[PDB]
Amino acid sequence: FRTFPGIPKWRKTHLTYRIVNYTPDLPKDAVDSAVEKALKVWEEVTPLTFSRLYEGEADIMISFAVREHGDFYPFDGPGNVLAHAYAPGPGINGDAHFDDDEQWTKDTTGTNLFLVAAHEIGHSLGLFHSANTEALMYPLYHSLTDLTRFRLSQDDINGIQSLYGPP
Ligand SMILES: O=C(O)CNS(=O)(=O)c1ccc(N2CCC(c3ccccc3)CC2)cc1
Ligand SMILES: [Ca+2]
Ligand SMILES: [Ca+2]
Ligand SMILES: [Ca+2]
Ligand SMILES: [Zn+2]
Ligand SMILES: [Zn+2]
Structure with missing residues (x-):
C-alpha cells in the first residue's frame, strides 16, 4: 500500500458525507446504494463511521x-x-x-459506479495507490466478471488500518 505524502488522515472517527447532486444515468436509489456500499466496505475494517447530511458542509x-x-x-x-x-x-x-x-452503471459491463466510488473513498480516507494488482487501490480501472466476488485485498486492509486501526 501507499499513503499520501505527509500522511494526511482524519483525526476523528465520525465522518459525514453529502451527495450534492445526481447523475442522469441511474435512478437515485441506485446511486445512494452504490455509495453506501462503498462507505460500508471501509467501515467494516476500521473504527470509522459515516452519516449522511442532506444540507450544509x-x-x-x-x-x-x-x-x-x-x-x-x-x-x-x-x-x-x-x-x-x-x-x-x-x-x-x-x-x-x-x-x-x-x-x-450498476452492472459488470460499463463503468461501474460502486467500484469507482469505493476506490475514491479510499483516497478520501488517506490511501494512495497500490502496486498489488488485486487491490482496490490499484491505479488502473477494471471491473469484475461477478460483482458478488468483490472484496478488499489484504493490502487495502493493511493500509487503512495503518491509519485508523482495526475495528
Ligand atoms: O482515482 C484515480 O486514481 C484517478 N481516476 S481513474 O478514473 O483513473 C481510476 C478510477 C478507478 C480505478 N479503480 C481501480 C481498480 C478497481 C477495482 C479493484 C478491484 C476489483 C475491481 C475493481 C476499480 C477502481 C482506478 C483509476
Ligand atoms: Ca453521465
Ligand atoms: Ca471536504
Ligand atoms: Ca473522463
Ligand atoms: Zn474535481
Ligand atoms: Zn486512485
Missing part, C-alpha cells in the same frame, strides 16, 4: 460534474479519468467528484 462532499467544475483538475470528456478525490482535510479535501461524461 459535510466532510466528504460527493458530486457529479463535467469538464471545468471548480478545482484545479477539470474532467476530460468520455473515457480516461473517470473520477477523482482529495486526501483528508478541510474544504475540498475529502471530496469526491465523478465525471458525468462517463456512462455510469
Whole structure:
C-alpha cells in the first residue's frame, strides 16, 4: 500500500458525507446504494463511521460534474479519468467528484459506479495507490466478471488500518 505524502488522515472517527447532486444515468436509489456500499466496505475494517447530511458542509462532499467544475483538475470528456478525490482535510479535501461524461452503471459491463466510488473513498480516507494488482487501490480501472466476488485485498486492509486501526 501507499499513503499520501505527509500522511494526511482524519483525526476523528465520525465522518459525514453529502451527495450534492445526481447523475442522469441511474435512478437515485441506485446511486445512494452504490455509495453506501462503498462507505460500508471501509467501515467494516476500521473504527470509522459515516452519516449522511442532506444540507450544509459535510466532510466528504460527493458530486457529479463535467469538464471545468471548480478545482484545479477539470474532467476530460468520455473515457480516461473517470473520477477523482482529495486526501483528508478541510474544504475540498475529502471530496469526491465523478465525471458525468462517463456512462455510469450498476452492472459488470460499463463503468461501474460502486467500484469507482469505493476506490475514491479510499483516497478520501488517506490511501494512495497500490502496486498489488488485486487491490482496490490499484491505479488502473477494471471491473469484475461477478460483482458478488468483490472484496478488499489484504493490502487495502493493511493500509487503512495503518491509519485508523482495526475495528
Ligand atoms: O482515482 C484515480 O486514481 C484517478 N481516476 S481513474 O478514473 O483513473 C481510476 C478510477 C478507478 C480505478 N479503480 C481501480 C481498480 C478497481 C477495482 C479493484 C478491484 C476489483 C475491481 C475493481 C476499480 C477502481 C482506478 C483509476
Ligand atoms: Ca471536504
Ligand atoms: Ca473522463
Ligand atoms: Ca453521465
Ligand atoms: Zn474535481
Ligand atoms: Zn486512485
